[model samples]
Target: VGRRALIVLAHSERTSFNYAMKEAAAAALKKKGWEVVESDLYAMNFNPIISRKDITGKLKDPANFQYPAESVLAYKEGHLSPDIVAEQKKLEAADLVIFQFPLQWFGVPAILKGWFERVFIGEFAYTYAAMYDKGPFRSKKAVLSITTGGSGSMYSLQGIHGDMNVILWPIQSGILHFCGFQVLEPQLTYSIGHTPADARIQILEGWKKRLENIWDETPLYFAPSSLFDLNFQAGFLMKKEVQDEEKNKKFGLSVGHHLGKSIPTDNQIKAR
Candidate 1:
């Protein structure tokens, strides 16, 4: 099936650099024959706040709950008013989801975070392991198209941000990956305010050209198998081992253990 792309812009200014990037990305995707859906956060008057009413009202009636329950219900019941249902429907129909936002406090803007907190929630996004295994989002892909105030060097290991990879864990592993979407490596434009206009244009054009490859590229953390196996378990353990070693050797000496050590050794295997 031909893929559909949704570009969510969290910028308030249509003329802002972040807005321009989203427009360029949409144009690129459209040229590749992907249908584009856009959600302009400011123009839509998106309300980012989560109130006490939102929490209690939905709990009173479970059926009233939307996927990211807090935000959707507010839209539905006219509490935190906006025309966001259209965006939600587009999200459901989309094969590729892209979030274009200015990095605020090393994360997405308040509005974008609210969107996830409300829309990408239980039932539609996750269920017990028996039914969906890892996630309810089986055939979807998500990417972050972000603009940061800090320079690219600042996000590197030797620089101020500690490590860009660690900064991404909450969004990558906790959200999109948790919901079973194949997460594309994020496309970040660093030092947005400081970037020279000509340099920014080139960067934008480069990303525009790369949109065609987003869906076809291998997902960030995918194995070849349809079913996860012992090798996958080993890989998970290996990651922990590396993390432990890094912490012990660099940060401090910290002991780490595998989640469980019940895997049978040679002699124990024979006894079983």
Candidate 2:
């Protein structure tokens, strides 16, 4: 049997360029003899907020909403609603899952993030202390097919938007990898609004071919478990090169693992 794939689209408009590209990719994948499924978030108006109803289904104690704890218990008891269960099943059936959306600022659209917050949750997708290679989604593959309003040049290493690689690190490391999917190099179509008609088609055509050869593409590089000392501290992926010069720098956050050196980030105060 052929492998299954799911295209999760988060665009609000079906006629927009976001859906245009998503449809194109779907067409190309279908042509390549692969089974495909689609989750049009906007059309479905997918619920992003995780609450008592999702897990306990009107049976939960409303006084306290211990999200992870409730989710774990609910999943064990088969309490997930049909909608959530359906989405979870889609993820489980797919060998490859594609997220198609326009980058809102430097990250995913809110609804798409909501998809993760609700679906890839609890004991179904993750649990406390079970992350990275030890997480549940191991052996699967995920790729982000994203569009950006900003110019491509602006997201480069020395560009104003910051390195695209750095911007994607959190998603690549913290989300997909953390849940155990081997993340592929993202397919970016930047400067969408400024691109000419011909150039837009060219990009779409390129994306089509990219899907046709999806498996041929290599996954992005990530720090291996060997680089992390699990014994170091909770929530700190402390590298071998780290320096704990100040024991009280950021004090209680994972940001404290910077070894007292400045972090290369876009943490700036924007004057409105």
Candidate 3:
């Protein structure tokens, strides 16, 4: 089946370089026969601010804290003041999600942040205590396409801004990974304001090439790294019958031995 992608543009200006990048990525994905949904936050006049209405009106009852039917209806009619309902549906339906934006203060724009805060709430992105049991967003993937004003060298460990990897951890690992979406390595277009036309074209071409390979590429979440070393080894070990059984038994005893008789004496526990 063909991939379905949602491209969210965070730039507020129509003529911004970030906007150009968004268009380039969209066209590239479309050429690869992917179904695309482009959300222009600014042009769509998306409300980034949460109001009393959102907290006190539609989402009043905590028991009924679901996306209101009226909210869905308003979104379909393009009359909803909040963008959360429509954005949530699009996110749920998509096979791949592309966040196209300029790096603002080393983070996403306010609108996109609000999008996460509102739409990714309880029962949507995750649930309390049972988070891992709830999701891996089994059917979805996420890619962040970022344009930076600084030179690429400046984002390195020895450069002016420290490592870009550190700067990106919250977005890539925390938000996307925590939500269970398999995130792709970000596509960073550096020095956007000063890149020559030929260089710009080359970057666009590279993005297109990667877009074509998105489905076939290994997800970043599965890659071996110091960050995931323990989880990776544990995941493999847990699949074996002997190791799984032993681990379970050890954990069960540590918590409390559920022997059939009344609380066993130390000797009885050890004997068992």
Q: Which candidate number has the best TM-score?
A: 2
Rank the models by lDDT, top first: 2, 1, 3
Candidate 1 local lDDT, 138-245, one digit each (tens): 688888888888887887658977667656667766677667877776887888888788998999899998897887775564321223232544553335444554
Over 4 Å off in model 3, which ranges?
A: 55-82, 129-136, 222-272
What C-alpha lDDT values do all the predictions have? 0.66, 0.76, 0.66
lDDT for predicted candidate 2 compared with the true structure:
0.76
Tell me, what's the RMSD of every candidate? 9.7, 6.2, 12.7
TM-score of 1: 0.72
Q: In model 1, where is the ten-residue run with the lowest total lDDT?
A: 263-272
- Between candidates 1 and 3, the TM-score winner: 1
Ranked by TM-score, the better of candidates 1 and 2 is 2
Clashing pairs in 1: 68-118, 68-119
lDDT-best of 2 and 3:
2
* lDDT (Cα, tens digit) per residue for candidate 3, span 68-154: 444433344544444566787788888999999889998998988877766665556754332321354746888888889999889
- CA error at residue 263 for candidate 2, angstroms: 11
List TM-scores for all candidates, in order. 0.72, 0.83, 0.71
Please give the distance, in angstroms, between residue 166's alpha carbon in candidate 2 and its true position after superposition: 2.1
Looking at model 2, the pairs that clash are none
